[PDB]
Amino acid sequence: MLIDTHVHLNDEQYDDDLSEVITRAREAGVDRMFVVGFNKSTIERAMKLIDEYDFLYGIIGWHPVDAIDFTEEHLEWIESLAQHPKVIGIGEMGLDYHWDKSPADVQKEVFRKQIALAKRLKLPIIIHNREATQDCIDILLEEHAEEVGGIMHSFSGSPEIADIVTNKLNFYISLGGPVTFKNAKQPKEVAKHVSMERLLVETDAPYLSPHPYRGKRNEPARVTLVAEQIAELKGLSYEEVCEQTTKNAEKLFN
Amino acid sequence: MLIDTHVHLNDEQYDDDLSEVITRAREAGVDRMFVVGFNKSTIERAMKLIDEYDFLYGIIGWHPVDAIDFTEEHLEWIESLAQHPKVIGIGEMGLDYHWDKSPADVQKEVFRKQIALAKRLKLPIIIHNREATQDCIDILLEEHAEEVGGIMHSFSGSPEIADIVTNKLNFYISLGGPVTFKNAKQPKEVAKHVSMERLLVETDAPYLSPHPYRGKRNEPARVTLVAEQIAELKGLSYEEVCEQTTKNAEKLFNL
Ligand code: NI
Ligand code: NI
Numbered sequence: 346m347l348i349d350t351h352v353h354l355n356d357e358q359y360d361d362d363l364s365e366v367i368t369r370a371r372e373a374g375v376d377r378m379f380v381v382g383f384n385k386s387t388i389e390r391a392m393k394l395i396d397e398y399d400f401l402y403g404i405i406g407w408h409p410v411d412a413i414d415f416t417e418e419h420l421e422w423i424e425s426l427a428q429h430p431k432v433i434g435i436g437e438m439g440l441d442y443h444w445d446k447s448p449a450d451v452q453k454e455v456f457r458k459q460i461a462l463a464k465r466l467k468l469p470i471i472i473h474n475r476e477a478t479q480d481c482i483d484i485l486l487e488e489h490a491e492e493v494g495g496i497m498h499s500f501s502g503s504p505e506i507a508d509i510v511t512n513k514l515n516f517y518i519s520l521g522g523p524v525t526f527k528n529a530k531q532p533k534e535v536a537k538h539v540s541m542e543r544l545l546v547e548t549d550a551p552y553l554s555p556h557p558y559r560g561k562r563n564e565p566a567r568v569t570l571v572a573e574q575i576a577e578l579k580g581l582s583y584e585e586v587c588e589q590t591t592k593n594a595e596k597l598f599n
Numbered sequence: 600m601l602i603d604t605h606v607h608l609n610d611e612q613y614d615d616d617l618s619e620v621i622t623r624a625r626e627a628g629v630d631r632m633f634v635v636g637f638n639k640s641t642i643e644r645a646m647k648l649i650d651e652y653d654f655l656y657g658i659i660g661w662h663p664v665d666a667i668d669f670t671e672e673h674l675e676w677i678e679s680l681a682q683h684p685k686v687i688g689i690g691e692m693g694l695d696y697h698w699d700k701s702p703a704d705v706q707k708e709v710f711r712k713q714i715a716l717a718k719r720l721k722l723p724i725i726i727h728n729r730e731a732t733q734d735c736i737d738i739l740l741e742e743h744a745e746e747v748g749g750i751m752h753s754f755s756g757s758p759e760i761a762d763i764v765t766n767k768l769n770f771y772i773s774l775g776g777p778v779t780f781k782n783a784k785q786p787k788e789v790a791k792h793v794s795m796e797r798l799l800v801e802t803d804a805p806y807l808s809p810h811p812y813r814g815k816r817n818e819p820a821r822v823t824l825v826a827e828q829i830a831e832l833k834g835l836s837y838e839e840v841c842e843q844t845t846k847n848a849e850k851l852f853n854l
């Protein structure tokens with residue numbers, strides 16, 4: 346039994362066939378999934394899915410790419426939604442230097458505001474980092490994010506950054522489809538290097554479908570290919586990776 | 600007057616409006632462009648473009664993504680084509696760890712074979728690196744690529760890597776649209792750090808259209824936006840970056 350700790354079932358890409366996508370994941374041993382909302386539309390859709398399906402939990406927050414759209418009203422709105430017993434984490438939050446819609450200074454202020462929110466709610470945080478690794482680490486360290494705990498979601502950095510993440514911040518590291526890519530050296534090295542007690546699995550569906558479905562619409566059932574690859578890389582049974590990644594998710598979340 | 604040192608005018612995206620695109624670049628002061636062929640199809644199209652247009656030059660070689668497709672017959676075909684007076688460089692070659700079509704070990708062998716080929720042709724090499732920076736620098740040092748010179752094309756690594764590229768390999772560094780991106784600081788840091796006498800501009804059209812056309816089909820005319828951005832970052836005139844990038848191109852290649 347696995348948990349897909351990070352999935353966008355709230356995406357328009359599932360509008361035709363969500364029920365079948367969820368059934369395929371359940372039938373593959375994916376018993377629980379954490380639906381991630383990161384702006385007004387995706388939060389609304391997320392809150393409707395966690396009401397409709399018993400085994401779906403919500404992570405809500407504000408995406409760095411959309412940081413310029415984050416208002417005082419949105420921050421009070423997320424704080425009141427988080428009182429829902431199945432809203433278990435705050436995110437995906439962080440920094441993204443690939444897209445230019447939001448400048449870095451606005452991204453950093455929205456990031457700090459959501460750390461402060463997560464501390465008030467006593468919920469863990471889910472971190473999106475794209476091309477902003479050292480700026481994210483400095484923020485997590487400055488804002489004492491070790492108080493709330495969290496995930497560096499779909500982490501690709503050096504093992505030296507992984508060690509700051511697990512040993513200084515006491516965060517978890519989630520791995521997704523990229524651990525399955527042939528020439529993806531960094532994620533395979535992260536999976537080998539990081540303790541099994543710090544690892545979580547995710548799809549980020551519909552994005553980043555693993556081998557052998559790269560370029561195709563991802564779905565939560567494919568989290569089994571991530572878990573298989575972690576088993577292969579660490580010399581562990583699939584059963585051991587399912588059991589430990591579940592233990593880890595249950596420990597971090599409520 | 601500027602040179603677009605790296606463009607894919609051979610791309611299907613120009614099938615219906617190539618003439619208009621070339622005319623728009625020429626009117627914006629982009630007098631010469633270097634068309635890049637990197638597999639059977641793109642080489643054949645590039646070879647045709649340089650015979651049709653007086654001011655287009657060719658750079659031919661084999662792309663790391665398609666390294667598994669490279670044969671002994673392709674290596675001999677490229678060696679022959681390179682005799683063309685307007686074939687001035689071999690590339691784009693290198694390493695790409697984004698895509699999985701070709702495994703690193705086969706990409707490394709094909710990269711080494713084209714360094715050896717460029718040494719025989721006495722022609723400079725154009726380097727494609729994606730997510731493989733240290734593996735590329737190691738190959739270039741180990742194979743004494745300083746003997747042919749070349750371009751780190753669309754470079755975005757650290758200043759330490761730039762100093763190895765310029766001060767040890769004696770390569771040039773080209774910048775494209777990403778120098779116009781606000782949040783990706785590394786290209787701007789490279790533009791500020793690297794000597795004006797080591798810099799070239801490119802579009803890589805139709806990819807990586809600069810601001811304010813991010814998302815849109817790129818074209819060689821947009822190399823002026825890259826030139827403008829460099830001038831601002833190095834506190835130089837546009838005329839200065841145009842003249843220096845042209846002298847650099849004219850010195851590395853034999854046009
Ligand atoms: Ni993300
Ligand atoms: Ni996500």
Ligand code: NI
Nearest residue numbers: 691727728752
């Ligand atoms: Ni390239």
Ligand code: NI
Nearest residue numbers: 605635691803
């Ligand atoms: Ni190119």
